[PDB]
């Protein structure tokens, strides 16, 4: 992807995180677990649903072919009719396929971007208080309990407290 | 090891694949097919209303009353009309239907006729009205179109015909009539007595004077003679006037246009499916929530939009890592 | 207390909105509307050239010279033609105009006619030329088309007509003539004497032989008879030759095609707006520098491109989100 | 948008910077103020203006409907004519609406990208000499006077001089 | 002095430029032109099959046998047909060709006729069969179309003609005939004796009866008279029957339709180019692997797709720094 | 571009790097050299070649004009025919020109993105073991020989060995 997070520095996705699209895998003395990020996953569903519907709705006034009959001595207008109809059908087939292709790429890049943004949201919060592994992982210098993990996920983490 | 938190994304067992510009067959966690690819292979009622299935009859055969088309003497209201590519029962007596395609176009906006008598058989006291042909069999015997009358001479005489019909109905009226093209001068006098004939027809807008054409012609349905049929829409309160001294295939029945709306003439070899649908194609009906389909371009009803595509799948989820 | 520098972006009080694929009603600092949505509701001159407003007359009524259309006997140069959907003054004497739509197509490429007398009404010595009808009233008296002549028998005789006109002008000439279809045989002889008639017309390209159609027809404008009109374009130095022994509606005036260019026949109910525009539609004129408009698909002049959109707005500035 | 700066780490826009689209707020001992970054703003103005002209100029060969008249027995071609003209009007209405939509999205992402790029341009200059706060601001370890602030905006900030 | 690794990208000597929405004339390291802009200015064989170059003759002139078109009496199979914009040799005797455009349309699906005799000159025992016109010169003397015959009265009589031809061939047959419209009544009797005349033509589908039109007309090619030509397709096993008592321009030769396929009638002033191509336009042939071209919209063969673009260039490489 | 690498922090391209689209310039005691990165260059070639083929294949069923003739009294249908044919040619000319412009923009952004991703791959691999000058280069603390430069490109680079 264009943002280098999905199939980038994060080597692969998690089978164990069947919770949401983007999330965390925390570890401390109390244990370890998977938790999805609510703001970013919800943002992703809304943007993607809006995309699907916009694509359907832009095609709403597509061309509709009508059966027309012509006699043995109206071959020129018969052929004109056939080419005009096939013409619009071809134009709208192209519009449909191309839109799907272009937006599919933007969708996958959109996901990649959200993971990247989520990585930065954590990094800019922790700063000097945690080591950056490059794996998609941050190693805490100090102890981060379950309530501390809540502060990272919620975005309520307090820097001057640990620095 | 001290405490840690990692950022990551969803992976599942999905093998669903989408395409992009730079890449084909990309595995995603979630995808959405938006293309309907199946139909029921039947001709169905459209939203509770049965189509008119003309079977082996053409529109011409139906309206003129080809005796082989008696099933369709008084059809109920229809949602759409189905006609075969090559209906066997058409103009039983050989010839043609003037502006036939333009008539069929009008039909596309009509859902129901009510057939009425406009000139009774009893009207013809000075002419023979029982003209038949072996080109138009009924029960294997010589007969004729039901809705028009073949007038011939009586007592070696064909006096000038004058008939009027005033449309006192509130609906537009489809009126049909024809001219007979005989084989030679001898046949002309044998049937109509008068050697030089005409049919004049007038309304408020129509001004027509037809003259028969003798030509030496190949046999079609056993007959070298020809009939050429004409039509007009007679407005409420207008009147149609016929005058002729021979070769006149006169109206008997005409059609009140009692229901107009969305309809079509569908070309199909299929017949009635004893079935109901919201969207019909000439090759089968569609029951779908997809925004697109690729069944056939000619549909009627509430339908997905047609595309020529074999495949349309949108990515919804993300790239599914191995 | 320690010094610092921040990176940021512009915000303002804008409530302008634009749409994208993934979201709608996005508030932006600046936006550019590119859709013209207004018009003046008038029919105006095009680039200083006045249109031809036909009022209650049709093109047929104008060209043949329906007495109700005397306003349009010798019209000046026009930029476009305006015609109502159902003009009251058309073929006063009922009938039809052969290849009428093809004639109207030709008009779309014409800007001016010079109408000329080609066969004087007074030049008919062996025929009556004063035929009138109550179907074409003028000042409450039976009249007739101004540009063609109703010929009938004189002294119970209708001798064969042979008339020629050679186009000695340098412009193409639009020539009009017609045939009268009577009610019955008695009326035929009463008007034209000869029971069996024809009109033959020939040019370098035209080879026409018309025969009247007697039929019993409904009254239209009080008359059951019909007149069928025909036309041709006579090239410079070519000649038109008429022959007839009855039912001939002869040309009197014909039209020199003097200015050819871009024109159109617009369908509209509006009248003249004492106004000038670069872009005209059937419902109003456009004075805009927008690239698009949604007024009406049929326009003439220098115009924005027509689209069916209710809204087209480009984002130019950025996502407007002021700190609170 | 996709680049996570606009409504990202820099939480909101400045109404106080009436100067350009992207820029700086500084505060030192001499005082404080906003200043637009001249090149990136002029860069963006150029790209957006060109985009607008390209959209307009690409449509210039659009379809133009012509009034055509048909008689009572020319209904098939009348319908053909109508469906053809409506056909092109729908095609071009789609092209216009869709282009505007896709390009509105690119325009907003373009701005988001430009801010991100501007933030990085400063970040790579300052390095060890300033603390990255994460809100779009950098806190200086040394004193940075007006001429020092100007060199940061310039891209002429001298690293070895203060470290 | 200390070690360092840098990240960077490719630059080269390219001055290739591409366009984007936001930027024009962007210099890139690599680009791919996809628009063919050149043609050979020649009319060539299409995939080894020579075209039919009608030179100064029209399709009318060719088929009817305008004496100036003898070059084309029995042409071999063609890949496409070339006609000039205003061919000088058309209807030498002035008049018109009925449904000419519909005939030319059929030609667009035909690659070869085989011309055959359907009514020999030896058939005409009671009529003169050598009528000519100075409007149809050949070698500076009056002549006539080669494929149809001008019949006139013999011994001051024109007895009624009855002629039939049964299509015993396996191929459809293009049949041509005409009517002569005289200058006046004296001319009518002078050529045909009978003052009131007709031509009736019948097949299984054709029902025609023509009557000549006397009118006073301008001289075209020296003559005020006119000939109007008609045509039908005669199916295998069908027969055509002519009957006439004057003004009949009778068939002599007709055309078996022996090869059907892709063809076209191109308008061009160009002459034959003694070359071969796989893609031809009216202004020159195209030899290209480009997906698009801008030469001319009307092409035949395996061709790139036509666009109106003056330039189409895709970026492949990256932005090239000076 | 959108990713701020090509003509961003990396001021220019290298004439000396003939081997690929993206790579490295190193400087050690053994001698300075140019080495292109194998995967990212190959990935880009596959992506760009496919983009080209997709564009060609989508235009595969464009409109094809056919010569039709009309007589002196078929002017309306002649005009109708002409406008219909011109109409589709304009539509497909538009489609071809627009797709190319849009995909040209995406291709340049793609390269720009690929450059950034390669820079970050080096950045996250090095971390503390190297300095960041900000011009797309990394100053080593320890004298890195040819064997050190090799491990970076492969991804073999052992961080614990050098820290
Ligand atoms: C080899 C041979 O000569 N055999 C004759 C055979 O031709 C003839 O048959 C009659 O031929 C006439 C044409 O000359 C018609 O084809 C007759 O058929 C009908 C028909 O079915 O259409 C009979 C019908 O009663 C007639 N109806 C009316 C209203 O007139 C029609 C009608 O005349 C024509 O269709 C008009 O074109 O014709 C057919 O019986 C027989 C009988 O004479 O004798 C053989 O030896
Ligand atoms: C109920 C009844 O029988 N009333 C008749 C009444 O019809 C008749 O009026 C004349 O009727 C004839 C038709 O038979 C025409 O309609 C006459 O109208 C005119 C017209 O105005 O168009 C008169 C006009 O002077 C005529 N002009 C010429 C050049 O001939 C034309 C023309 O002949 C026809 O239109 C051709 O089709 O007709 C109308 O006067 C009256 C008077 O006779 O007597 C009642 O008893
Ligand atoms: C100055 C003057 O009046 N001179 C006449 C002169 O017109 C006349 O020439 C003949 O005129 C007739 C028409 O009246 C034809 O135009 C003759 O031309 C031909 C032709 O070449 O087409 C001669 C030809 O042999 C005829 N062929 C047949 C089969 O009949 C045709 C044919 O009749 C017409 O084309 C039918 O429309 O006409 C032309 O020679 C001369 C000689 O008679 O006498 C002068 O006094
Ligand atoms: C695939 O995953 C789903 C859960 O998302 C699970 O229910 C299903 O059993 C799995 N299928 C197979 C074949 O393993
Ligand atoms: C993947 O793409 C190939 C060729 O592009 C195609 O044949 C196939 O249908 C796709 N899916 C497979 C092989 O499962
Ligand atoms: C038909 O009858 C109505 C009512 O009797 C009458 O008013 C009308 O004039 C008639 N129509 C014609 C064409 O005579
Ligand atoms: C926004 O500010 C401008 C002054 O620059 C003012 O004209 C406009 O009314 C304001 N909009 C409001 C207050 O809604
Ligand atoms: C904004 O969009 C919504 C639907 O997306 C619509 O209902 C509303 O009218 C729009 N405009 C407003 C509220 O000004
Ligand atoms: C018309 O007149 C001109 C000039 O006198 C003459 O040359 C020409 O032949 C005439 N045209 C016809 C068709 O008679
Ligand atoms: C550009 O470089 C290529 C090889 O890299 C060389 O063959 C060519 O001559 C050069 N072109 C110019 C115009 O210098
Ligand atoms: C570069 O683009 C301009 C338009 O921006 C054009 O006029 C020019 O011809 C192009 N190429 C050149 C000068 O080589
Ligand atoms: C033509 O000839 C064939 C075979 O001799 C015959 O069967 C057929 O009926 C004939 N066609 C006509 C129209 O007479």
Numbering used by the authors:
A (entry chain F), D (entry chain B), F (entry chain D): 1 to 163
B (entry chain E), E (entry chain C): -1 to 320
C (entry chain A): -1 to 322
From the paper:
However, it has been established for the H1 (1918), H2 (1957) and H3 (1968) pandemic viruses that a change in the binding specificity of the virus membrane glycoprotein, Haemagglutinin (HA), of avian viruses from a preference for α-2,3-linked sialo-saccharides (avian receptor) to a preference for α-2,6-linked sialo-saccharides (human receptor) is a prerequisite for efficient transmission of avian viruses to humans. However, surveillance of human H5 viruses has revealed a number of H5 mutants that show enhanced human receptor binding with HAs that contain other amino acid substitutions in the receptor binding sub-domain. We have carried out structural studies on the HAs of a number of H5 mutants that were isolated from infected humans in Vietnam and Egypt to explain differences in their receptor binding properties. None of the substituted residues in the mutants we have characterised make direct interactions with the receptors; they appear to have their effects by perturbing the biochemical properties of the receptor binding pocket.
Unlike the VN1194 Ser227Asn/Gln196Arg and Asn186Lys mutants, the tyTy Δ133/Ile155Thr mutant shows a slight increase, rather than loss, in avian receptor binding. Consistent with this observation, avian receptor is found to bind in the same mode as that found in the wild-type tyTy H5 avian receptor complex – a trans-glycosidic linkage between Sia-1 and Gal-2 and an edge-on orientation for Gal-2 (in relation to the view in Fig. 3). BLI analyses show that virus bearing the Δ133/Ile155Thr double mutant HA has higher avidity for both avian and human receptors than wild-type HA. Crystallographic analysis of the double mutant reveals that the structure of the sialic acid binding pocket, near residue 133, changes significantly compared to the structure of wild-type tyTy HA. In both the avian and human receptor complexes of Δ133/Ile155Thr mutant, by comparison with the wild-type, two additional water molecules are observed in the vicinity of the mutant residues. They are located near the polar 4-hydroxyl and 5-acetamido groups of bound Sia-1, irrespective of the receptor type. ‘Wat-1’ forms hydrogen bonds with the 4-hydroxyl of Sia-1, and with ‘Wat-2’. Thus the combination of Δ133 and Ile155Thr mutations creates a more polar environment for the two extra water molecules. The interactions made by these water molecules likely contribute to the higher affinity for both human and avian receptors. Comparison of the wild-type tyTy structure with the structure of the Δ133/Ile155Thr receptor complexes suggests that the presence of either Ala-133 or Ile-155 would restrict the occupancy of these waters due to their close proximity to the water binding sites. Therefore, both substitutions must occur together to allow the water binding necessary for enhanced affinities.
